[PDB]
Amino acid sequence: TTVDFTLHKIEQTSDEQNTGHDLGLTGRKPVQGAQFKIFNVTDAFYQLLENHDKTTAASMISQNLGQYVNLQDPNAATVTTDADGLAAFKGLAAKTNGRHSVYAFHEAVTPQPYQKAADMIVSLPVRQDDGSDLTNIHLYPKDSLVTKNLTEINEQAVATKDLHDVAVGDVLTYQVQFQIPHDIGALADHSQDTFKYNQFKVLAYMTKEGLTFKALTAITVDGQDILKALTGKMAFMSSNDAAWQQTHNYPFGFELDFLGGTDPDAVRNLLTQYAGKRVTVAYTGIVNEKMIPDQKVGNTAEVSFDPDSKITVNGPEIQTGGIRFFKHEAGSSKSLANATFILQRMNGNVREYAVLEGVNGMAGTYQPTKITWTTNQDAATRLKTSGAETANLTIQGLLPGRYTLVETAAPEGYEILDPTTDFEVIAGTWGTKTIRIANTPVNQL
Fold first, then answer.
1. Which of 320, 368, 375, 392 is the most buried (most CB within 10 A)?
2. Same structural domain for residues 130 and 150?
């Protein structure tokens, strides 16, 4: 007599069981391209069963399957999940050497950006509220999705999306969610003293200049803050440290390893308490003067447990606005230096004026570290034009929206023509055109 195993590979995004029956239209998301191997573990299971009870025997095999079977086995039948997450092992022996057969299921390959489902075993038979046994046994393995996201801007929450308009000086809270393996505390297969896992590296980075690393806000799992307990027992590094430029050359980022630090055994035990559960690693970065327009910068995140393999996920991109002006003489393209402006906006029937930080010495181009807005007009930063050729006043790090450039003082020898120049900042770009501004020469005597 024979038996079938239908697998229903599903996505997991939270903390979470196999009745053996079909659960029908569950309304959950499938996972295609996950290879599972099958192993008959009957003999090895029953040899364990002499000393240990059934739950203990199963636990023992769940961790360290490669101890009890050969995982790199050509003989072992492999099945890959299809577009609906379906995969079936057909035609297995319901009994093996006089006992009801016990089969194990190892996820051999696990697609991006998913962590593997636990190694599960099934001891036959599975029976119902009438004593009849199943012929086809439905299993619902769970691949935990690795995510990355931008969650807060200046400590305020924001609607999740793939492209965020920022302002220079903004603090951006990013997050990386991922699973703690169910076999984290396990020892290596065929080893008494060495551990299975000896690396648990999370590596976030931008390949472009926009951000500057601030901090590592929190680490949370099961609604518990871990970081406070963790810090000093794990290897940590940001792009602010000189160690970063040796191992990487990414402009921004950080690399945390739980099992790469001073006290890896201590952490492994803590990690085991929440084994299987999903952690979240929050970190902040600040938008610097090197964040420019016509630029979309995301970060990536590389979760890994060895140098050989890694799970890579991408978060949302960020861009910021800029604008150029060309202050000229009326009826020519002669550049006019030392024309004085201030930047204005409305804030609901109320006028505000821009104050720029980190802006001294700068004349033509302005590349501030922050911008704030005051109703006291005399406190606004007075902008000066250069003698530059195609554009002699540029400003960056603005949010998209509507502004007004207000000429406070014309350059000497000239009178103001258009005192108030209304203009729109376009999302993530320098804008449609460089905005020309004429000035009338007064032929003085």
1. 320
2. no
Asked if residue 184 and residue 154 are part of one domain, the reply reads: yes
For residue 26, give its domain range. 2-144
As a whole number of angstroms, the distance between CA 408 and CA 419 comes to 8
β partners of residue 351: 346
For 257-275, give the DSSP string: EGGGSS-HHHHHHHHHHTT
Q: At 156, which helix (H) or strand (E)?
A: strand 156-157
Tell me 399's DSSP state: P
CA-based torsion, 244, 248, 252, 256: positive or negative = negative
Last residue of a domain, one of 116, 144, 172: 144
Q: Which of 98, 124, 144 is the last residue of a domain?
A: 144
Over its C-alpha atoms, the chain yields an Rg (Å, rounded) of 31
Length of the chain in residues, anyone? Answer: 445
Same domain, yes or no: 170 and 313? yes
DSSP β-ladder status, 300-304 and 147-153: unpaired
Q: Is the dihedral of CA 92, 96, 98, 100 positive or negative?
A: negative
In three-state secondary structure terms, 27 is: coil
**135 and 160 both lie in a single domain:** no
CATH number, domain containing residue 130: 2.60.40.10
> What is the resolution of the experimental data for this entry, in Å?
2.5
d(CA 319, CA 347): 22
Q: With contact defined as beta carbons under 8 Å apart, do 2 and 79 qualify?
A: no
C-alpha distances in angstroms, 308 versus 199, 305, 378?
11, 8, 61
Record the tokens describing residue 118, joined without a space: 């636990």
CA 144, chain centre distance (Å): 15
In DSSP terms, 364 is beta-bridged to none
193 three-class SS: coil
Residues 294 and 333 in one domain: no
Do residue 208 and residue 127 come from a single domain? no
Do 337 and 304 belong together in one domain? no
Tokens standing for residue 254 = 């950080």
